[PDB]
Structures are given as C-alpha cells and as structure tokens.
Amino acid sequence: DKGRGANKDRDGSAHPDQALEQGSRLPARMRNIFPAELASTPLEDFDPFYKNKKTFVVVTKAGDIFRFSGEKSLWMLDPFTPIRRVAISTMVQPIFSYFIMITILIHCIFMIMPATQTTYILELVFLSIYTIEVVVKVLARGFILHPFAYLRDPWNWLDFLVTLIGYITLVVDLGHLYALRAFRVLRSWRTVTIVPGWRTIVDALSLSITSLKDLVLLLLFSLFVFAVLGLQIYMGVLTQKCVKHFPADGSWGNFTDERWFNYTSNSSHWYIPDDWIEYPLCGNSSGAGMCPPGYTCLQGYGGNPNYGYTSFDTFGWAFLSVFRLVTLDYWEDLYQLALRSAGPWHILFFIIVVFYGTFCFLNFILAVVVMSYTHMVKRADEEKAAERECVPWQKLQGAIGAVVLSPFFELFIAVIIVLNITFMALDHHDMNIEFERILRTGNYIFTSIYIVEAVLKIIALSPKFYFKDSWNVFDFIIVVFAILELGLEGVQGLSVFRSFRLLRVFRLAKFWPTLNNFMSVMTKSYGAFVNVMYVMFLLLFIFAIIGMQLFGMNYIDNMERFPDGDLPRWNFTDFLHSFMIVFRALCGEWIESMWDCMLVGDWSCIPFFVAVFFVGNLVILNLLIALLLNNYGSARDSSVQRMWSNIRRVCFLLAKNKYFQKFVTAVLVITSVLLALEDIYLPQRPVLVNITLYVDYVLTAFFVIEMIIMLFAVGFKKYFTSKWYWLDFIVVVAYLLNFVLMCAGIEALQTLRLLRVFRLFRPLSKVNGMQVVTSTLVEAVPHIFNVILVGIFFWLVFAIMGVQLFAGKFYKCVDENSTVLSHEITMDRNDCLHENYTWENSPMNFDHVGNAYLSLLQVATFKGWLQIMNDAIDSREVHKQPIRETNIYMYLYFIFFIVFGSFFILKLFVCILIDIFRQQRRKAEGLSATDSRTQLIYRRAVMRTMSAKPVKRIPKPTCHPQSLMYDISVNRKFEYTMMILIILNVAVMAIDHYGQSMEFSEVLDYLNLIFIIIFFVECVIKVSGLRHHYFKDPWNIIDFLYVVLAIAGLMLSDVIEKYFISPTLLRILRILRVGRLLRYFQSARGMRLLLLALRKALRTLFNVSFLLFVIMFVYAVFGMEFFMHIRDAGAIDDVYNFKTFGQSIILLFQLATSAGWDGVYFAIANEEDCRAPDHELGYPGNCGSRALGIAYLVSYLIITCLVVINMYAAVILDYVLEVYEDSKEGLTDDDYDMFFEVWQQFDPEATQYIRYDQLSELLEALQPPLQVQKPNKYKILSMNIPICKDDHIFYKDVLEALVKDVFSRRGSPVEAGDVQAPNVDEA
Amino acid sequence: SAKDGDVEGPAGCKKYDVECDSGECCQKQYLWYKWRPLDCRCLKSGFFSSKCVCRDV
C-alpha cells in the first residue's frame, strides 16, 4: 500500500530507472530527459533486439508481474551513454553474477587447505577480481549520494568492507592488527543466494533477530538478578578445601602464631586423593563434603575450580556461571560443585534458575523463532498460490502376471525383507563357525530371490512398465549391486560394494505405511530442509575459518599451559578440528571449549563462543523445529432383590461423598511418605521397623474393604473396564500376595510393596489445573509410540553401519593404573600380553547392535559421546593398538547421525506435544474444534466484556497528618522515586567482590544504613495513608518484611543468634524486592506482551512441575530399593548416591535434564569385581545390574526428558501465540485493565455510571487501541450508547460500543458482523 | 618343559591365528605363560566379511 505507493511516484517524479531486467531484458532507458525507447505499455517488439525481448519481459510481467525486475539507479550523473553504458550492460549480465559467485566458491576451497607459497599469490588474484566488481557497480551507479546507489543495498555493504579489509592487510597498511584478516570469510555469506527458495529462510532468520530485541533485555535483567543473588550466597564458597591440622611437633615449630598461616597456605597440606587433578571441595553443613579425619574445611586457599573460571567471587564470573546454568551445559558439574561445599538445601537455588531460566526464557526464544518462520511461509504460500491460479510368450505372461500382481507374492517378499534385516542385525564380532555360516548361506538365498522376483516382474508387467514406477527402479539398483558383491566376491576392492546391502533396509518403507507416510513428508517439502541445512553448515564454515585464524596459533605457542603439556582432542589448530569445536557448540556444549581457548589466549573467546552458541543453537536449531512444525503437524427373588440392592444403595452413597474421598486420599499420601523413610539407616532404627510393619497390615485390609465398597458401587462391568480400577486391583492382588507369603514363612517381596505409589496418580489428576496436563499425555502416547518405532528404524541403519565400522576395534593395551600404553611400546595384543599388561575393551562399544543402540543413545543426548568419538577416531584394525587421532574422518559418521537422529527424530517429540496441547486446551475451555482462529478472537474479546467489573478507589482518610499521607503515597512522582532507589540499592550489591577490604566494606555498610532509613519513612507513609489496603499488594508485604527484619538487625545485639536473624535471609529480601520493575514497564510494548503471556501460563506451568516431582518421587523410592548397595564408580560416591530419599532427589533432578546419565549408568550397571550378597550372614552385596540399570535409565530419560520437559515448551508456545494474536488484531488483557484505570477517575466510588458530559472527556483519556481523539463527538453520535433515565450511562454500554469500534476500524471483510452477532448470543 | 610354542591334541592341527575350518584346531596351546584352550572363531574384517581363524577362548 505504501511501498508501491512510491513505486511509480518517485520513478515518475524524482528519478526514473536507467534500465530493467527480468527474463533476458537488457535494455538501457533513461529518466525521460534523453530517453531511448523504454515502453508505453503496448508490449511491442518492433524496433530493437532488447526491446523485442522486452515484450517477452512484459509477457513475463503478465504472469510474474513483480518478482525479478532490476530497478536501476537514478540518473544523477548526466551520463547520456558514455562508457558508463558499458558498465550498466556488464552489471546486469547473468554471467557476471555467475562469475563472481564461482570465485567465491574457489576462494573458500583455498581456506580449508593449509597456507603455502601459492596461497599468498592467489590472494593477489582474488582481491583483483573483487575490486573490478566494486568499480563496475560504482561506474554503473552512484556511491551513496543519490537513492538507488551502490552503498544503499545491504549486500553491497558486505562486499565493500571486506574488500577494504583485504586492502589494509595485503598492501601494507597499519602493520599491526592482523585480527581483521579472519573476517575476510564473510564474503561467502552471499552464497546463500544460490539454492532455490533461499529468501524464506533468510527472511525468517532476520525477522527472528529483530523480534528478539525485547527478550534479550528481559533475559539480561533476569540474569542480572540471579547473578547478584548467587554472588551474595556463594562468594568464596568454591574455594573450600580440606586442610591438615597444625601439628604438635614437626618441621613447623611448636608455636601457634602466623606460622599456622605458613603451614596452611602450603599446597602439600591440602587434601587431594591420588591420581586426581583437582582438589575435592568440602563444607561444614550436614550433607556436605565431609573432610577425612585429621582435616578441616577452610576457605581462602588456592583457586576456584576449572582453572579459576568457575566462581561466584566477582560480578563478572558470577554472570558467566549463572549463564551456563540457564544454558544447561555441563551444569551438573557446577550443581555438584555447589551442593558438596554448601549443602543439599541449596537445590532451591537451582530449581528457581532452571524453572525461570531454561524452562521459561529459553522457550520464549523458541516461540519467537516459530512465529517468525510461520509468518514467512504464510506469505510465500499465498504468493505462490496466486501464481498457480509370441504364442507361448503371451501365454505365460497371463500366468506369470497372475501371481505377481496379486497381494500374496507381495506378502512373501515382505517376509524375506524383514528376514533380511534380521540377518544384517545378527552380524557381530567373535562369531562361532556354524552361526557365521547361516548368515552367509542366507545371503545367497536372499540374493537369488531378489533376482527371481526382478525377472518375474519385467516379464509380467512390461520392460517399459517396469521402469515406470520408482519402487521398481530402486529394487533394480539392489539386484545390480548384489551381483557386484558376488562377481567381485573375492577379486579386490569389495569393501565399497558390500556397503550397499544397507539399502535393502529402506525397502521396508513400501510395505508398512507408518514409515511410508513419514517418507512422503520428506519428499513433499524437501528444499525447505535443504535451505536450513545449507544455512546451518555455512554459518559453521564461517565460525570455523574465523576461529582458526584468531585462536589457532595460541594452541601451539602457549601449549605448555595444558595439564599434560599436549594439545587436547578439541582445538583450533587446523580446519577439521575447528569445524568440530564449532559444531560441538551448535549442539549446546560451549563452555569446556571456552575454558581452554581462554587459558591459552585472552578475553576474545568469550564473545566468540557466546555468539556461535546464540546464532547456532538458539536460532538455527529452533528454526528447524519451526520447519518440522509446518510439515509434520498433520426365595422369591424380589425378596432378596430388596436386600441386595439396599447393599448397593449404601455403598454407592458412600462412594460419592466428599469426606470419604478425602479420607482415602489422606491415607494414600501419609503412607507414601512412610515409604520414603526406608533407607540405608532403617536397620538400626528399631521403632521405625515396627511402624513400617504395621502400616502394611492396615493397608492390606484398607485395600480390601475399599475394593469391596467400590465393587458394590460401580458393579463388575464398570470396575473391570476402567484403567483406574485395573490400577487399584493390581495393588490389592500385590498386597494379598504379600500377606499370603508372610504367613507361609517367606519374606515379603519388596518390589511389590512399592506398587502403592501408583495409586497416587488418581488424586493428582484432581488438582485445579491438571486436566489439560494429563489429557495431553494420554492423547500423545499413541503419537509418540509411532515416533519411537520410526526412530528405532532409522537408528537401526546407523547401528548396523556402526557395528560394521567399529566392532572389535575399541580394544587397547592398558597398564597397571588403567592408563593406555602408546605405540612404539605395544603395537598389538601380542606385545601387550607378552609383558603382563591388560588388553581391555571400552565399556561403550559397537560390538553387536545391542551395544550399538546404547552408544547411539549416548551421542544423541550428547552425554558420554566425547569418549565414544575418541575411540572411533583412534581405532585402526582388530588386534592393533589404537593411535591417537589417526582415523580422523570418522567424525563424519557422527555428524550425519546427530543431524538425522538427534536434530530431527528427537525434535518430533516437541512437535507432538505442541500439537496435542493446543487442541486439549481448546477442549477444556468449551470452545469448538471447528472454528478457524478468527471467530475465536472475537469470542475472546466479548467474554472479557461480560466479566469486567470497575474497581473502587481506596478511601482517602480524613485525619490530621493522614491527608498528606494519602497525597504523596499515590502520586507517580513518589512511586517512581522509590523505584529508582530500589534499583540503586541492588546495583550497589553488585560491586561486592571476594576479599574486598575493611574500608571498602565500610563505605558500603554506611550506604545500606542510609537506604534502610529512607525505606523506613516510605514504609510509614504508605501505611498511614493506606491503612489496611496497604497489605493488598504482594510487593508491599515484601517491602514491609524487609524493613522490619532490617531494623531488627541494626538493634538487638544481645540475641542468642545461631543463624537466628541471619544476614543471608536479609540479602534475599533486598534482591527479591527488585521485581516491582516487572509491573512498571508498560511503555515497552514488546516486554509487556511477553510478561502477559507468562502470567497467564503460570498456573499450568506449576502443574507440569508438580507432575514432574511425582515422577521423581516414584522413581526415587524405586531407585533406593534397587541401587542403595552399590560400589562407588563414575558418579556414585559418598555424597551423590541412592542411599536416602533426599540424596536420591538430588540425583533424579539433575538426571531429569539428562545431565550426566552416562556416569550414573557406569555405576548402577556395574557387574564386575563386586561381591555377591550373603543373606544368612547379614550382607547385601555391592553389585549392580546391567539389565535393570538400562530399563531404569532409558525409562526415565524418555519419560521425563523427552516428553515432560517438552511439555514446558508446549505450554509456553500456546500462550505466546494467543497473546500476540490479541495485540495485532483483537484486544489484550492489559487493555481492559487500562479502561477501568481511567474509569475510576470519573467515578471513584465505583457508582458504575458516569455523566454524559464526562464521556467526551473519557475517550480523550483512553490510550489506543480504544481511544477516540478530537473531534470525538460525531463518532459518539454513531456509537448510540443507550442512556438510563438520569443522563447516566452504564459502564458496559461504553465498553461494548468501544470493542465494536476496534473491530470495525481494523478489519473490513467479516469483522463487524461477526463481532455484533456474538454479542447478541451472549446477552 | 613349556616351550614358547607348544600344542596338545592330534598330529597336524591349526595353531593360533591360523585359519580353521570348523574343526582341526589344536586342543591346547602354550602362549603367554599359560596353557590356553583354543577354539575356532570368526572375527570382523570389513563390511559383512569375517575371516575365521583359531583364537583362544
């Protein structure tokens, strides 16, 4: 409307074009001062040659009017065909922009190769070709001086500055920088314009970054609050070590003086166990680190962990640690480095920062990326839709075709393909001689059957109808390659040709239709995935060349800083290593790489790894979820009848009461906390053993008396047909079976006593908002079962591939201390076992496809994969020693699995729960499923009118000082002044650092004395002026709690305080008071729209987390019964284990975000060098179970991390769409709050009526979208606003007639009539 | 006794890392400072290929 309003306007009046180009259009017009034969819209082809094809360009302007025309410059130079005409014809050639594009692709190749003598001589050539190209386009346009010049287009600001940087580097200019040379790769961003359909992904990427402006300011605010909060309670805490006591003898003299400090600062006196790199932390709290005997936990000696980079000691390092906790990478280290030194009750710091950081604010990022991509696909689809609108030979063929066409020969090939997939999965390492023969002689039978069915197919159908369909031409490639595996059975080079047996797995895609439907979506919209995947690897290419030119020579020069003095496996030293340290940070794992870029370099790694994590993970991996969302989203019987029916009369009345149902729920909750109290201490608690024994007798009679009552109430037909009563009946059987065995000598099975925690789920679903949460998980379980089966299929292809690449190759020679001998000592198993060493295998391997399934789970979650990829790169042959970094191109196997198995299969879980939740939340609000998204906007704006009530002004008191106490307690000057003081009170807490001084500590101690005096007057004014309405706002309580506990700290020194009035609780009430800011920004429309969608989601986000804790409760009581007696390995130790319930909850919370499941698996599945249990002596055995550890962890990871964490993303996504649909078209909830905020200043008493002369005053005081400015009177004259018989009008009549105004001015087509029809139905 | 290469079993049989056809592999072998019992196994070598040689249990 506006941009095409200046289409012919400035091209008619300001300056016309000098040419045009759309489909081989090579004219050169002018600005009508000396023009030459442009057009008169006659679409003629008479005079010239380029004017002849201009009719074909205008015939292309009849179906494709505005897509390709090249708008030339203004004239602005008086160039009436000089040599500038040569440049305007050179510039528009299709071979000119094919030529510069090829030199970019060649100059990218000479960046992955190492630099040599000829590398410098091509930089002379490429800078020459890129500078003719900047001279042509400026000798064919302007510079910036007129419109439509060279520097007016954003692609020309790229290829100009990058040419100017190449001038300063190549020819000697300024000599000294050399860091700008890394930025020469940015010219290869314009190679995105080579793949068809590029503008939809590049515009959705630019629309995302523009729309993430008001989220970053809200994330940077909340990261500021959590990093002051973590600064105040964790300062100096990560330095706590175990220090040995000062002796009563010895090399240090006996006098206890500052020789204590000499002895204590000595590093040889800090406890470290043997062959460990870092010192173990410890604390004095209850379930903390627990220093060995002869030691004491002390602060202030040595450094913080992770080369000193993990700390809360300054505001800088606290901001980085709070940011890696919002991100979620390696957070289980910081979580375990903080609860070991501070104690287990500090899980509450980590629950809040994970709930508000990564479960809320990182799903607002996903919701913005999805809306930006959906807005571009919606534009592109409607723009394309406008563009679219012999006698025996014939005898046997009727007989051969009689069996082939029928669906019985099609069944027999389906059985053999399933049987062929089974024989490829049974191949493994170390097979015996007869079982390996079955797999060879079955290969000969499968091959000849595929040959017979491919020669009975061309005879039956036709030789020209066989090549018709695409499944017969894929079946024909299989029988060609199977001949090559048998013709080249033993000649040479047959490793390549037997790899193409894996393509027979994809022949299952024709028969069963769940996988067939999944393949059709990949072939329908494929180029949308090609654009996202090419933009993904091109950004990775740019961060990889930038990385090795900036951080590359630090790894070689300062190599001595690394702990052994050698390079890590992950560095920036060449191209493939730089591509993998950057691909790793795409996947969400950036901080261990940032730790040693910064150990060896400087501060410049901190903007690098944040920017490659931001663009790569939070935008590009979410733009791939928005792509799967738009493509995969779719006697005398009547004498006993009177007695048996009075039994069912009593029981049915009793089963429906409120008090009977609350009594049953109270028994189930209390007895389930009894179940969390059997732990490793329950033997030696003899009174608790008897209570546990008697509750099992009450419940085995309570479960029977209740079952009989529920069986008279609901009957046999409706009891045994419901899934809640098959849950109850299994617990009744499992407690009668325990009562039977206990009488008959046998001790009762402990795994059947724990079954009564499942009876906890039925009253959990009765909580206020739990019905949308649990109905989605029941509707989604047939959908996510089909994503398991399809994902088990695609991981079978990479399991049988990875067994054939790596089986038997993860063996290595191993010394006494489990360290790996290098080669030149032992090169094979002969040399290893000749010198009594051990030839061990890795615990995570590809030996059979059962082990391979478990290694691919571990690289898909990115938890354990660093060790698996090291074994594969080192592996060379079967009985040979692995050499470091030798099979380095096996990284490409893992890139294509992570792309197709983790970025694609696991995101279909997020896709399902988003689609199920929208339609269940619609079902819970009574809305109809067949209402297409516009009629629900108008229905939502009318239901808020019927529920609207004007609020009453707080009564102003009339006392002697209390008039002014109301005057100043209400003005915006005083309520903004006291908000600036809260911001300054807390920004002064940010300059607190560890070990500051006694005088820096006293300046700030005096400033806190001034603010508490100021905050005491501001408390006494707002309590005087607002006498009991002061306590109605929840931020006035936290103001009032803080001032009371701060005055009572400054006095009352002779208290018996033992953390009684502790300063840690005062520091939290200083900072929690900042959140008054969240209700003061409303002029920021983009934030107020995003805090509104959060506030409406808080109820059902609390219900996802309370479902989460019950799933953690059930598995903690099961994990204590399984893994309480387990030897320490990997992650299980004296602090983090399954011994008690609270210690189990520390583990299952960490493990809910999948963090560290590989090292938890290593302990609870350990079946080697342990001790068998000894029942009749009193010993339980320290053995794990492999089968029970897999069925416990794979169970928790898919139940809690793949579906219930993904429920947070579904709920956020649903409300951000509804709130932004309100701000654009309908009316937000905060717009009805501002009507009654203006309404109460025209009736303070809420007399619910205003004077008629007050209404033209009213509409001037409203702010848009409801306002009507001057002259509003004649629009009031059209709203018609029915008046009562006092010239006073009702509030709803004003509010109803203003909703109809917003919908009429904004939408023409169906907006007024559908809004007025819904208001008649609701009244 | 216990020479660094020794076999038990019938006269003429396959020693360690020598290709076996499903029998004909020696009863016992003295390698690495013990008597190990030998067996015929098929170990992985290439895509869907395995050479079958005498290897200890």
Ligand SMILES: *[C@@H]1O[C@H](CO)[C@@H](O[C@@H]2O[C@H](CO)[C@@H](O)[C@H](O)[C@H]2NC(C)=O)[C@H](O)[C@H]1NC(C)=O
């Ligand atoms: C843990 O508790 C011990 C003992 O209460 C504390 O040790 C004292 O530390 C001070 C230095 O701050 C020494 O001068 C004392 O001699 C130590 N006392 C004893 C009995 O050894 C230790 O500071 C506490 N650690 C904390 C709070 O992190």
Ligand SMILES: *[C@@H]1O[C@H](CO)[C@@H](O[C@@H]2O[C@H](CO)[C@@H](O)[C@H](O)[C@H]2NC(C)=O)[C@H](O)[C@H]1NC(C)=O
């Ligand atoms: C360790 O290897 C050595 C040779 O590398 C083996 O050699 C024996 O060593 C013992 C002493 O420990 C001598 O008494 C024997 O004479 C050596 N030879 C033989 C054939 O046994 C030794 O067997 C290996 N260690 C063990 C425990 O077996």
Ligand SMILES: *[C@@H]1O[C@H](CO)[C@@H](O)[C@H](O)[C@H]1NC(C)=O
């Ligand atoms: C630590 O203690 C040892 C004890 O002999 C002493 O020799 C050494 O100088 C001390 N200091 C350091 C930094 O090792």
Ligand SMILES: *[C@@H]1O[C@H](CO)[C@@H](O)[C@H](O)[C@H]1NC(C)=O
């Ligand atoms: C005290 O210990 C430090 C290191 O812990 C050492 O450098 C210093 O020499 C010691 N002081 C003496 C031995 O007087």
Ligand SMILES: *[C@@H]1O[C@H](CO)[C@@H](O)[C@H](O)[C@H]1NC(C)=O
């Ligand atoms: C194992 O113990 C120490 C620590 O690594 C080392 O000095 C020793 O050489 C190792 N190897 C042995 C005892 O074979």
Ligand code: NA
């Ligand atoms: Na990391």
